[PDB]
Write a structure and sequence with these properties.
Layout lengths: L2 E5 L3 E6 L6 E8 L6 E5 L6 E4 L5 E3 L5 E4 L2 E4 L2 H9 L5 E5 L12 H10 L1 E7 L2 E4 L3 E5 L2 E6 L4 E7 L10 E6 L4 H5 L5 E3 H9 L12 E4 L2 E2 L10 H14 L5 E9 L3 H13 L4 E4 L15
The chain binds the ligand C[C@@](C[C@H]1CN(c2ccc(C#CC3CC3)cc2)C(=O)O1)(C(=O)NO)S(C)(=O)=O and zinc ion.
Pfam family, one: LpxC
EC number: 3.5.1.108
InterPro entries: Ribosomal_Su5_D2-typ_SF (IPR020568), UDP-acyl_GlcNac_deAcase (IPR004463), UDP-acyl_GlcNac_deAcase_C (IPR011334), UDP-acyl_N-AcGlcN_deAcase_N (IPR015870)
């Protein structure tokens, strides 16, 4: 059978929050079968625990924020993308502040630290959410769709309407391509034209060339440039993989994004969950006949 996965060893990292600029200590710990991914604010007494689930998303402005009363866990999408890409079902994520550290702006440091610690297969069938019917959400010129598909694939298209793109960005990934080699290293990005307005909203306080592609009209301010010709759209795919992981189980289906951000991604998840005719929970007693496969643990 395809088994549930957790961490083999604890992961420890220190960084800063992209939006808050606050120093944060992160600890990833193994968890029992069917725990899912749970964020723990260990700076609070008592510790506040928030399951990484669609129902717990409270804010979607320039990041995905989990909320429980007046307690927040901000910018979960990049770490969730790493956990999704590596097939981690169960884990406790301890944080000493309200925001996950931004690291280098990609999922690269998280995939490296997790793979260095190693994974542990658990004695329980991994549960998957299989798309049975097409589900689409739209708002103005933004669109996000789930389509039935025997595997897992993501398509993204965005007209950024910005001179750095030299006059529309698009990418498609079928994950059977490497999440690690082709998507994990894609960094988040910011535009100089938005920075004054963002800082006024208390956003991007920790933003810099050390943790994002910084654009100023025609220029990429980062001295060393881009990691991929299409780094921008590849990061949009990374974000979608992280946001989609708030379903609580890996998907068997196709996601198509059209200028879709954290807000529309969450609305798609909520619409899907409400439409029980469009999905079902499945397990694979035999990995040889399954439409997906994972890297060795
Ligand atoms: C929201 C987003 C972009 C991030 C990245 N970002 C950002 C903004 C400004 C700067 C900057 C700057 C210059 C002052 C140094 C860096 C990152 C921000 O506000 O949100 C993201 O990746 N979320 O997961 S995106 C790609 O726009 O969806
Ligand atoms: Zn992002």
């Amino acid at each position: 059978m395809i088994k549930q996965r957790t961490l083999k060893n604890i992961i420890r990292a220190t960084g800063v929050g992209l939006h808050s600029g606050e120093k944060v200590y992160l600890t990833l710990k193994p968890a029992p079968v069917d725990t899912g991914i749970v964020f723990c604010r260990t700076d609070l007494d008592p510790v506040v625990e928030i399951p990484a689930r669609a129902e717990n998303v409270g804010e979607t402005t320039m990041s995905t924020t989990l909320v429980k009363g007046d307690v927040k866990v901000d910018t979960v999408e990049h770490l969730l993308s790493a956990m999704a890409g590596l097939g981690i079902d169960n884990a406790y994520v301890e944080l000493s502040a309200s925001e996950v550290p931004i690291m280098d702006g990609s999922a690269g440091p998280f995939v490296f630290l997790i793979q260095s610690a190693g994974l542990q297969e658990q004695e329980a069938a991994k549960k998957f959410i299989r798309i049975k019917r097409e589900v689409s959400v739209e708002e103005g010129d933004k669109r996000a769709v789930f389509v039935p598909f025997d595997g897992f694939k993501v398509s993204f298209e965005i007209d950024f309407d910005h001179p750095v793109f030299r006059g529309t960005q698009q990418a498609s990934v079928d994950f059977s391509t490497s999440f690690v080699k082709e998507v994990s290293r894609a960094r988040t990005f910011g535009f100089m034209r938005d920075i004054e307005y963002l800082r006024s909203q208390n956003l991007a306080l920790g933003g810099s060339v050390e943790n994002a592609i910084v654009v100023d009209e025609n220029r990429v301010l980062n001295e060393d440039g881009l990691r991929y010709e299409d780094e921008f759209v590849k990061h949009k795919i990374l974000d979608a993989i992280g946001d989609l992981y708030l379903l609580g189980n890996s998907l068997i289906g196709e996601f198509r994004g059209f200028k879709s951000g954290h807000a529309l991604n969450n609305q798609l998840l909520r619409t899907l969950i409400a439409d029980k005719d469009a999905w079902e929970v499945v397990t694979f007693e035999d990995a040889r006949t399954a439409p997906i496969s994972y890297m060795r643990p």
